[PDB]
Amino acid sequence: PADKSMMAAVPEWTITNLKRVCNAGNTSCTWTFGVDTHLATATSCTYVVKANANASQASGGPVTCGPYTITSSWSGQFGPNNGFTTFAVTDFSKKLIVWPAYTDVQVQAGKVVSPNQSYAPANLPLEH
Amino acid sequence: DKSMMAAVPEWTITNLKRVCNAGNTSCTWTFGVDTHLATATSCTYVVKANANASQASGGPVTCGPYTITSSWSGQFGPNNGFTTFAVTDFSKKLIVWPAYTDVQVQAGKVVSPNQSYAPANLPLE
């Protein structure tokens, strides 16, 4: 059969008010953001990543926020100036997943990312 | 508020296949990346680990214009383990995340149908 688009026929999920707050020693980074699917009222998420060092680079999760299972990994593959975090936000019940990705520059000041960034959910053919 | 999805065709991961050695210390992923606007790129993507290379985080590996990493997650239990690739065209600042359950790739068989993913913009500098 034809190539299968994995993009769901749903509105893009908007990640709202995304901010990273890391403690003094960068052993705990707290990500706060909303998942706004528009089809439902937005889910507010507190996503804490801990590590012995460089929590801002550490892989995090799985953390459950509302219907979502959230992980995150950081990549310096393009150099430390071009480091970026990729969240994996999965609604298990809907079998939908998005990958919000934020460069360190966007989040380094601990200031909100604006505008809010929206991503097209992909189907993930999990088997219930 | 601002869509990060690029206004280009979805990229198709063609003939995605995972082959792991006997001890699962090395899994070789083979696939093509077809943007449909340029010649497809053939990719060989080897993940090695002391154990469970099929669960190991891979990359970065370069295949043509793409920098590829991969992450595996058992957050939904072993039955619903799935691998997420991060395929980034750094020059275009475009990235897709082809995601395949272990069910889809366990046979070492080619994933069919091929699966297409909408690239997102990655605002690198």
CSV table of C-alpha atoms in Angstrom, one decimal:
chain,number,residue,atom,x,y,z
A,1,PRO,CA,0.0,0.0,0.0
A,2,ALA,CA,0.7,3.7,-0.1
A,3,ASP,CA,3.2,5.4,2.1
A,4,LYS,CA,1.4,6.1,5.4
A,5,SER,CA,1.4,9.6,6.8
A,6,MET,CA,1.8,9.4,10.5
A,7,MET,CA,0.5,12.9,11.2
A,8,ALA,CA,-2.8,12.8,13.0
A,9,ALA,CA,-5.9,14.6,11.7
A,10,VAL,CA,-5.9,16.8,14.8
A,11,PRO,CA,-5.1,20.5,15.5
A,12,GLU,CA,-1.4,21.1,16.3
A,13,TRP,CA,-0.5,20.9,20.0
A,14,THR,CA,0.6,24.3,21.3
A,15,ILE,CA,3.3,24.2,24.1
A,16,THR,CA,2.4,27.2,26.1
A,17,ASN,CA,4.4,29.4,28.5
A,18,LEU,CA,7.4,27.0,28.3
A,19,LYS,CA,10.1,27.9,30.7
A,20,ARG,CA,13.1,26.1,32.2
A,21,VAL,CA,14.3,26.9,35.7
A,22,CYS,CA,17.5,25.2,36.8
A,23,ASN,CA,18.7,25.4,40.4
A,24,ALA,CA,22.1,26.9,41.4
A,25,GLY,CA,24.2,23.8,40.7
A,26,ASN,CA,22.2,22.6,37.7
A,27,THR,CA,21.3,19.4,39.5
A,28,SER,CA,17.6,20.1,39.1
A,29,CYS,CA,15.9,21.8,36.1
A,30,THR,CA,12.1,22.5,36.3
A,31,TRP,CA,10.3,22.8,33.0
A,32,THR,CA,6.9,24.3,33.2
A,33,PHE,CA,4.6,24.5,30.2
A,34,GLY,CA,1.1,23.8,29.1
A,35,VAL,CA,0.0,21.2,26.5
A,36,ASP,CA,-2.8,22.9,24.6
A,37,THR,CA,-4.4,20.4,22.1
A,38,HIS,CA,-7.2,23.0,21.4
A,39,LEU,CA,-9.5,20.0,21.2
A,40,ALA,CA,-9.5,20.0,25.0
A,41,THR,CA,-8.6,22.6,27.7
A,42,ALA,CA,-4.8,22.8,28.1
A,43,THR,CA,-2.9,20.6,30.5
A,44,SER,CA,-0.4,22.4,32.8
A,45,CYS,CA,2.8,20.5,33.3
A,46,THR,CA,5.6,20.7,35.8
A,47,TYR,CA,8.5,18.5,34.5
A,48,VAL,CA,11.4,18.2,36.8
A,49,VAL,CA,14.8,16.8,35.5
A,50,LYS,CA,17.4,15.8,38.1
A,51,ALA,CA,21.0,14.8,37.6
A,52,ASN,CA,24.2,14.7,39.6
A,53,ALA,CA,25.3,17.5,37.2
A,54,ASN,CA,24.1,19.3,34.1
A,55,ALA,CA,20.4,18.6,34.7
A,56,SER,CA,19.8,21.0,31.8
A,57,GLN,CA,21.5,18.4,29.6
A,58,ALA,CA,20.2,15.3,31.3
A,59,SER,CA,17.6,13.0,29.8
A,60,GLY,CA,14.4,13.2,31.8
A,61,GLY,CA,11.2,11.4,32.4
A,62,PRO,CA,9.1,9.5,32.0
A,63,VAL,CA,6.9,12.0,33.9
A,64,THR,CA,3.1,11.8,33.7
A,65,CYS,CA,1.3,15.1,33.3
A,66,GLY,CA,-2.4,14.7,32.9
A,67,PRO,CA,-2.9,12.3,30.0
A,68,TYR,CA,0.7,12.8,28.8
A,69,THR,CA,3.9,10.8,29.3
A,70,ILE,CA,6.8,13.1,28.9
A,71,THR,CA,10.5,12.5,28.4
A,72,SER,CA,13.2,14.8,27.2
A,73,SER,CA,16.8,14.6,25.9
A,74,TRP,CA,19.3,17.2,25.2
A,75,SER,CA,21.7,17.2,22.2
A,76,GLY,CA,24.9,19.1,21.7
A,77,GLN,CA,25.4,17.4,18.3
A,78,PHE,CA,25.6,20.8,16.7
A,79,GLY,CA,27.9,22.3,19.3
A,80,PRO,CA,27.2,23.8,22.8
A,81,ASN,CA,26.0,27.1,21.3
A,82,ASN,CA,23.4,25.0,19.3
A,83,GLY,CA,22.3,22.7,22.1
A,84,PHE,CA,18.7,21.9,22.2
A,85,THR,CA,16.2,19.9,24.3
A,86,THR,CA,13.7,17.6,22.6
A,87,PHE,CA,10.7,16.7,24.7
A,88,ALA,CA,8.6,13.6,23.8
A,89,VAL,CA,5.0,14.2,24.8
A,90,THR,CA,2.9,11.2,24.4
A,91,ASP,CA,-0.9,10.9,25.0
A,92,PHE,CA,-1.0,7.1,25.5
A,93,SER,CA,-4.8,6.9,25.4
A,94,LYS,CA,-4.9,8.7,22.1
A,95,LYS,CA,-1.7,7.1,20.7
A,96,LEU,CA,-0.4,10.6,19.8
A,97,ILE,CA,3.1,12.0,20.3
A,98,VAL,CA,4.7,15.4,19.6
A,99,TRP,CA,8.4,16.4,20.0
A,100,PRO,CA,8.6,20.0,21.2
A,101,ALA,CA,12.2,21.1,20.6
A,102,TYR,CA,13.8,24.2,22.2
A,103,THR,CA,17.3,25.4,21.8
A,104,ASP,CA,19.2,26.3,24.9
A,105,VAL,CA,19.2,30.0,23.8
A,106,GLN,CA,15.4,30.1,23.8
A,107,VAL,CA,15.2,28.9,27.4
A,108,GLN,CA,18.6,29.9,29.0
A,109,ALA,CA,17.4,33.1,30.6
A,110,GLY,CA,14.7,31.2,32.4
A,111,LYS,CA,12.3,33.5,30.5
A,112,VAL,CA,9.1,32.2,28.8
A,113,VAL,CA,9.5,31.1,25.2
A,114,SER,CA,7.3,33.4,23.1
A,115,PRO,CA,5.6,32.9,20.9
A,116,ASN,CA,4.2,29.5,22.0
A,117,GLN,CA,5.3,26.8,19.6
A,118,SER,CA,2.9,24.3,18.2
A,119,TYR,CA,3.6,20.9,16.8
A,120,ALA,CA,1.7,18.4,14.6
A,121,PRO,CA,1.0,15.2,16.6
A,122,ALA,CA,2.1,11.9,15.1
A,123,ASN,CA,0.3,8.6,15.4
A,124,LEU,CA,2.3,6.1,17.5
A,125,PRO,CA,0.9,2.6,16.8
A,126,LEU,CA,1.1,1.4,20.3
A,127,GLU,CA,-1.1,-1.7,21.0
A,128,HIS,CA,-3.5,-1.4,23.9
B,1,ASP,CA,0.5,30.7,18.4
B,2,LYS,CA,3.4,29.9,16.1
B,3,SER,CA,3.5,26.6,14.2
B,4,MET,CA,6.9,25.1,14.0
B,5,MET,CA,5.8,22.7,11.2
B,6,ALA,CA,7.5,23.4,7.9
B,7,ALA,CA,5.5,24.0,4.8
B,8,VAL,CA,7.2,21.2,2.8
B,9,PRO,CA,6.1,17.7,2.0
B,10,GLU,CA,6.2,15.1,4.8
B,11,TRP,CA,9.5,13.2,4.7
B,12,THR,CA,9.1,9.5,4.1
B,13,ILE,CA,11.3,7.0,5.9
B,14,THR,CA,11.6,4.3,3.3
B,15,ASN,CA,12.2,0.6,3.9
B,16,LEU,CA,13.0,1.0,7.6
B,17,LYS,CA,14.6,-2.1,8.9
B,18,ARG,CA,16.3,-2.9,12.2
B,19,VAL,CA,18.8,-5.8,12.3
B,20,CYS,CA,20.4,-6.6,15.7
B,21,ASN,CA,23.2,-9.1,16.1
B,22,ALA,CA,22.8,-12.3,18.2
B,23,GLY,CA,23.7,-10.7,21.6
B,24,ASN,CA,21.9,-7.4,20.9
B,25,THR,CA,25.2,-5.4,21.3
B,26,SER,CA,24.8,-3.9,17.8
B,27,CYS,CA,21.6,-3.0,15.9
B,28,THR,CA,21.9,-1.7,12.3
B,29,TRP,CA,19.0,0.5,11.1
B,30,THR,CA,18.7,0.9,7.4
B,31,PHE,CA,16.3,3.3,5.8
B,32,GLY,CA,16.0,6.0,3.2
B,33,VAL,CA,14.9,9.6,3.9
B,34,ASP,CA,12.8,10.9,1.1
B,35,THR,CA,11.8,14.6,1.3
B,36,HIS,CA,10.1,14.2,-2.1
B,37,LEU,CA,11.7,17.5,-3.2
B,38,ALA,CA,15.2,16.1,-3.6
B,39,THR,CA,16.9,12.7,-4.3
B,40,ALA,CA,16.3,10.4,-1.3
B,41,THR,CA,19.2,9.8,1.1
B,42,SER,CA,20.1,6.2,1.9
B,43,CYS,CA,21.0,5.8,5.6
B,44,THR,CA,22.9,3.1,7.5
B,45,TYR,CA,22.6,3.8,11.2
B,46,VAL,CA,24.5,1.5,13.7
B,47,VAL,CA,23.7,1.5,17.4
B,48,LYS,CA,26.2,-0.3,19.6
B,49,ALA,CA,25.9,-1.0,23.3
B,50,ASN,CA,27.4,-3.3,25.9
B,51,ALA,CA,23.9,-4.7,26.2
B,52,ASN,CA,20.4,-4.1,24.7
B,53,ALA,CA,21.6,-2.1,21.7
B,54,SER,CA,18.0,-2.2,20.5
B,55,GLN,CA,17.2,0.0,23.6
B,56,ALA,CA,20.4,2.1,23.5
B,57,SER,CA,20.5,5.8,22.6
B,58,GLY,CA,22.2,6.1,19.2
B,59,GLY,CA,24.0,8.8,17.2
B,60,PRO,CA,24.8,11.4,16.3
B,61,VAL,CA,25.4,9.8,12.9
B,62,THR,CA,25.5,11.7,9.6
B,63,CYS,CA,23.8,10.3,6.5
B,64,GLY,CA,24.0,12.9,3.7
B,65,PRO,CA,22.6,16.2,5.0
B,66,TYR,CA,21.0,14.5,8.1
B,67,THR,CA,22.3,14.2,11.6
B,68,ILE,CA,20.5,11.2,13.1
B,69,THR,CA,20.2,10.3,16.8
B,70,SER,CA,17.8,7.7,18.3
B,71,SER,CA,16.2,7.2,21.6
B,72,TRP,CA,14.3,4.1,22.9
B,73,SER,CA,11.6,4.3,25.5
B,74,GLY,CA,10.0,1.5,27.6
B,75,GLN,CA,7.8,4.0,29.5
B,76,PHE,CA,4.7,2.1,28.3
B,77,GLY,CA,6.1,-1.3,29.2
B,78,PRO,CA,8.2,-3.7,27.1
B,79,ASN,CA,5.2,-4.6,24.9
B,80,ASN,CA,5.0,-1.0,23.8
B,81,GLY,CA,8.7,-0.2,23.6
B,82,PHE,CA,9.3,2.2,20.7
B,83,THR,CA,12.3,3.9,19.1
B,84,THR,CA,12.4,7.5,18.3
B,85,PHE,CA,14.8,8.8,15.7
B,86,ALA,CA,15.8,12.5,15.6
B,87,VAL,CA,16.6,13.2,11.9
B,88,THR,CA,17.9,16.7,11.5
B,89,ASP,CA,18.9,18.5,8.3
B,90,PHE,CA,21.1,21.1,10.0
B,91,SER,CA,21.4,23.1,6.8
B,92,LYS,CA,17.7,23.4,6.4
B,93,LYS,CA,17.1,23.6,10.2
B,94,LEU,CA,14.4,20.9,9.7
B,95,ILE,CA,13.9,17.9,11.9
B,96,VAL,CA,11.6,14.9,11.9
B,97,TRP,CA,11.1,12.2,14.6
B,98,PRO,CA,10.3,8.9,13.0
B,99,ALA,CA,9.0,6.7,15.8
B,100,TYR,CA,8.6,2.9,15.4
B,101,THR,CA,7.4,0.4,18.0
B,102,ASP,CA,9.5,-2.6,18.6
B,103,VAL,CA,6.6,-4.7,17.3
B,104,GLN,CA,7.0,-3.0,13.9
B,105,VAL,CA,10.7,-3.7,13.6
B,106,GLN,CA,11.2,-6.9,15.7
B,107,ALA,CA,11.2,-9.3,12.8
B,108,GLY,CA,14.1,-7.6,11.1
B,109,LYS,CA,11.5,-7.1,8.4
B,110,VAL,CA,11.0,-4.0,6.4
B,111,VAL,CA,8.4,-1.7,7.9
B,112,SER,CA,5.4,-1.5,5.5
B,113,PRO,CA,3.8,0.8,4.6
B,114,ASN,CA,6.6,3.4,4.7
B,115,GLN,CA,5.9,6.1,7.2
B,116,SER,CA,5.9,9.9,6.5
B,117,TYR,CA,6.6,12.6,9.0
B,118,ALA,CA,6.1,16.4,8.9
B,119,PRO,CA,9.3,18.2,9.4
B,120,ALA,CA,9.4,20.8,12.2
B,121,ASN,CA,11.6,23.9,12.2
B,122,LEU,CA,14.5,23.8,14.6
B,123,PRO,CA,15.6,27.5,15.3
B,124,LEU,CA,19.3,26.8,15.6
B,125,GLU,CA,21.7,29.8,15.0
